Amino acid sequence: HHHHHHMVHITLDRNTANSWLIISKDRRQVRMGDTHQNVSDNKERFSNYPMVLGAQRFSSGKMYWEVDVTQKEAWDLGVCRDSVQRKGQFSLSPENGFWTIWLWQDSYEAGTSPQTTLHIQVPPCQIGIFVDYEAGVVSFYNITDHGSLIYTFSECVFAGPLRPFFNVGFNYSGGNAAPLKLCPL
């Protein structure tokens, strides 16, 4: 892929974070805390899962960013509508306003309904996310494996502004404490 030149500087929006998340000073890293992080509740915060949004909103154009997932056992990444549900239980699907992939229990899957098995030969340490708003495309790239394609959502019906979407995953195992990091341009 030659999408690198649509690179955008993403920062995390503290106000949207689940109350257990710890976002770094530079708003470029997020990890699961071992307790509630002493913030007030608000209607924006994801309540049921360790999720957070990027601050940036996209309604046109081509955008690209990269995320470090080194030594995590579980995470979700992609984009979502600004209007997605924040409270209660829900599935990650385009019908609910999400265009995502994930790692869970040693397999990679795309967040279709039902989910799609991904075929990755080289476990990624960094993921590239490309959005073409006008074309209705969200693509995922394996930066560890020379930028190889992971998955393309096409015919996307965004139906609103998009925000970068992150889930650091649960850390029930003690093996998933590591952060998600936005990688430099």
Ligand X SMILES: CS(=O)(=O)NCCc1ccccc1
In the complex, the residues that contact ligand X under the rule CB under 6 A are 18, 20, 32, 34, 48-50, 170-172
Minimum Å gap between C-beta 48 and ligand X is 6
Nearer to ligand X, 131 or 168 (CB): 168
Nearer to ligand X, 88 or 114 (CB): 88
| Tokens read off for 19 | 């109350």
Q: What distance in Å separates the CA atoms of residue 83 and residue 104, rounded to the nearest whole number? A: 26
* Closer of 32 and 180 to ligand X (Cβ): 32
23 and 52 Cβ atoms separated by less than 8 Å: yes
CB-closest chain residue to ligand X? 171
Minimum distance of ligand X from residue 62's CB (angstroms): 33
Least Å from the CB of residue 95 to ligand X:
23
Minimum CB separation of residue 140 from ligand X in Å reads 25
* Closest CB to ligand X among residues 46, 140: 46
CB of 170 to ligand X, least distance (A): 4
Minimum CB distance to ligand X smaller for 123 or for 175: 175
Phi, psi of 96 (to 5 degrees): -90, 5
